[PDB]
Amino acid sequence: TLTQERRLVTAIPGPISQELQARKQSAVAAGVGVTLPVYVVAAGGGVLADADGNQLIDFGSGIAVTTVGNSAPAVVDAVTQQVAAFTHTCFMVTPYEGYVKVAEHLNRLTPGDHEKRTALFNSGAEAVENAVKIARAYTRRQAVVVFDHAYHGRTNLTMAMTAKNQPYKHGFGPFANEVYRVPTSYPFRDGETDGAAAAAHALDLINKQVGADNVAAVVIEPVHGEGGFVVPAPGFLGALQKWCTDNGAVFVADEVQTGFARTGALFACEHENVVPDLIVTAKGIAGGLPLSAVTGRAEIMDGPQSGGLGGTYGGNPLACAAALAVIDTIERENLVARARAIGETMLSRLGALAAADPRIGEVRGRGAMIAVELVKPGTTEPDADLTKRVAAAAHAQGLVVLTCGTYGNVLRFLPPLSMPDHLLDEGLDILAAVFAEV
Amino acid sequence: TLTQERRLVTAIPGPISQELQARKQSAVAAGVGVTLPVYVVAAGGGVLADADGNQLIDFGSGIAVTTVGNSAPAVVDAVTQQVAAFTHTCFMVTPYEGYVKVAEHLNRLTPGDHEKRTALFNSGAEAVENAVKIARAYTRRQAVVVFDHAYHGRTNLTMAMTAKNQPYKHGFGPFANEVYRVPTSYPFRDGETDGAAAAAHALDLINKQVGADNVAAVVIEPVHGEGGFVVPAPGFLGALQKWCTDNGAVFVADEVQTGFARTGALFACEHENVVPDLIVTAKGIAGGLPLSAVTGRAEIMDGPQSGGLGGTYGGNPLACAAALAVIDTIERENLVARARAIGETMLSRLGALAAADPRIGEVRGRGAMIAVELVKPGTTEPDADLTKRVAAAAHAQGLVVLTCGTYGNVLRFLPPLSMPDHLLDEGLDILAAVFAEVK
Incomplete structure (x- = not known):
């Protein structure tokens, strides 16, 4: 009962999220750090809808949890x-x-x-x-x-x-x-x-x-x-x-x-x-x-x-x-085959990004568990800095993408298997845009 | 659906529960031990309803979890x-x-x-x-x-x-x-x-x-x-x-x-x-x-x-x-007040039971966390065997009482605060009769 559509009605995060975050900062231990402070009120398919009316594309699955879809x-x-x-x-x-x-x-x-x-x-x-x-x-x-x-x-x-x-x-x-x-x-x-x-x-x-x-x-x-x-x-x-x-x-x-x-x-x-x-x-x-x-x-x-x-x-x-x-x-x-179809698409699009952008050292993973490692071109020297710049731009365009890595230089993609084709495609378009911007 | 009354329709545990327990033994690791193998289908107020149609009085709260009542x-x-x-x-x-x-x-x-x-x-x-x-x-x-x-x-x-x-x-x-x-x-x-x-x-x-x-x-x-x-x-x-x-x-x-x-x-x-x-x-x-x-x-x-x-x-x-x-x-x-009222009832009834039965060495606790420690009469020597048997006999009459203690000799009571007064009374009546029955 929520439209499978990316929607940016406010700046990210919007006013109601920023108030909720001030509350968080006064009520919750600092040790519980928040990657993207948009406050969720509904979620399903491939979308998270926040308290300001925004709909963001979910490439995280809550860290690989909502594999079948939220709710x-x-x-x-x-x-x-x-x-x-x-x-x-x-x-x-x-x-x-x-x-x-x-x-x-x-x-x-x-x-x-x-x-x-x-x-x-x-x-x-x-x-x-x-x-x-x-x-x-x-x-x-x-x-x-x-x-x-x-x-x-x-x-x-x-x-x-x-x-x-x-x-x-x-x-x-x-x-x-x-x-x-x-x-x-x-x-x-x-x-x-x-x-x-x-x-x-x-x-x-x-x-x-x-x-x-x-x-x-x-x-x-x-x-x-x-x-x-x-x-x-x-x-x-x-x-x-x-x-x-x-x-x-x-x-x-x-x-x-x-x-x-x-x-x-x-x-x-x-x-x-x-x-x-x-x-x-x-x-x-x-x-x-x-x-x-x-x-x-x-x-x-x-x-x-x-x-x-x-x-x-x-x-x-x-x-x-x-x-x-x-x-x-x-x-x-048959979500096992759906995981395979999603991976085929992600590996193809990310392979093509990497073919034209040597800051991507490697594309790796299978199914709906895919990652790119970001390095100084031609080396294995990590670029955690670029990675944080990329995640910040991606969040700002309403795409929820997570980072990880022993060296802080890996961008990971954990879409739910309920992600629609058109939103997976749009999320990958946003990613390409971001690597072109940064 | 659920009537607030004790109901013993089969032996505890009944036949449907017994087939479920055999499934548990074939599927679940032996380390996850089960105290009372009645399989629950519904719960609310002061009552647990099992797969055989029995309704047991709950003096355990899932170990102090369903304080406000199940569901x-x-x-x-x-x-x-x-x-x-x-x-x-x-x-x-x-x-x-x-x-x-x-x-x-x-x-x-x-x-x-x-x-x-x-x-x-x-x-x-x-x-x-x-x-x-x-x-x-x-x-x-x-x-x-x-x-x-x-x-x-x-x-x-x-x-x-x-x-x-x-x-x-x-x-x-x-x-x-x-x-x-x-x-x-x-x-x-x-x-x-x-x-x-x-x-x-x-x-x-x-x-x-x-x-x-x-x-x-x-x-x-x-x-x-x-x-x-x-x-x-x-x-x-x-x-x-x-x-x-x-x-x-x-x-x-x-x-x-x-x-x-x-x-x-x-x-x-x-x-x-x-x-x-x-x-x-x-x-x-x-x-x-x-x-x-x-x-x-x-x-x-x-x-x-x-x-x-x-x-x-x-x-x-x-x-x-x-x-x-x-x-x-x-x-x-007003559940804080309610917890005090329950403690008052349980401390007085259990106190009266201790005045007549010197196998109860002490009644202790507050609110809906009350316990009796069982001993050899006139000593502090723990009586774990009696504690197991009283607990088993309570369960046979459809009262879910739990046990604890470093020496295995403590009978604990953790009723939900949604326990109706009349079922609190019947559970205590069940304990009193079990102490009278089990030597």
């Missing part, structure tokens, strides 16, 4: 029905069928034929924490291996596991220990197209410095998200999986950002036929509502004793109902 | 309107008024008159993690002081801060360090009704073993929930606050369980006119939806740099709508 009809109906029945029971006090059905679908849909079990929580960070807890409990080992460019969350442990100090970790430690980091595969920067070769180097550091028998878990994102939409070279994730099986360590795919159709497969692990021991999901899973999950090999998942896993809110009834509608909408609207 | 009408309305508008933007990308309004209301309603700021998250563990991040960033100190009988959550750091190893911590370490624990005030077991004297020993341990200028935060629940509804003697929390103010440490009140009307004041800190540096809230704040908060002195809250506090889902639009509804409901329906 997707099936989600709305399901949440509206669930909230009238009950809001919360604590599943561990008195359970409910929604939790159990979400677990069944996850067990069914994630990679591999083997027997699987699931546990539900609220946030990504919490699901990662729980993946580590499951692995230590099953293996009775201590060490967790993580990678360069990794991002896993804002709890103490998930901050330990995250690579970048500023601003995720700065001043918040000391950090949970027996966490060891080794290089990832980042071909633009490491010069190595062969993932098997890059994995050998990572695995040698694990063998020599950590000890294969001391490793509970090897934890990696299939595409490093906040780290710059960095995609390991083919062979890399596969060689980590084999090492884990061989040495009795639990291989954990962190699919918090890549899961649920985002990459042109239902899960990113599918791209290379990777079957992980555990898989962490969140963001896209419940179309906006707070839900996260750990799914994996039954025997590993069953490692922790009864009552050893939990949390008060986890697998909240409204969130499960929303997750079931998300799963149905993915199947019903 | 409270203002919540249902607020959530229904919000979901049709938007589900999520991530506040840190493009914000929305609901988050800011909730922060303003927390700033206004929490103890103290000074200027405050608030930040919003999803779970209690998350909020407590963030109180520690915030205290560490402002003070530039490392150490966090926690207490005996504490529970703060299931994340690595909140596991560290939690006292009891079994089953919260066992096998999940190693744990985030520079966490240091000292004794609390527990009059039934320590003999000391002077809270100020209990504090002196705790503070002397902080002084000598941590060092006052290394202490970033002192974190305590005003009533220890999971630990057995242990209520510190008067003057304990006051002495901690003062010591923190004098030594530059952040006093953090963890009111995740105790907040929002539960204890017969809006925040349990009010009972002793305690004004904490930071207060952590959750559970009852959003009437079932996942939301948590940290609120406190502006300077301290602004310690962390821009971009340092975050989380994709935090302050979710639906949850904020719910929270605004909860706050308005508490005010409109």
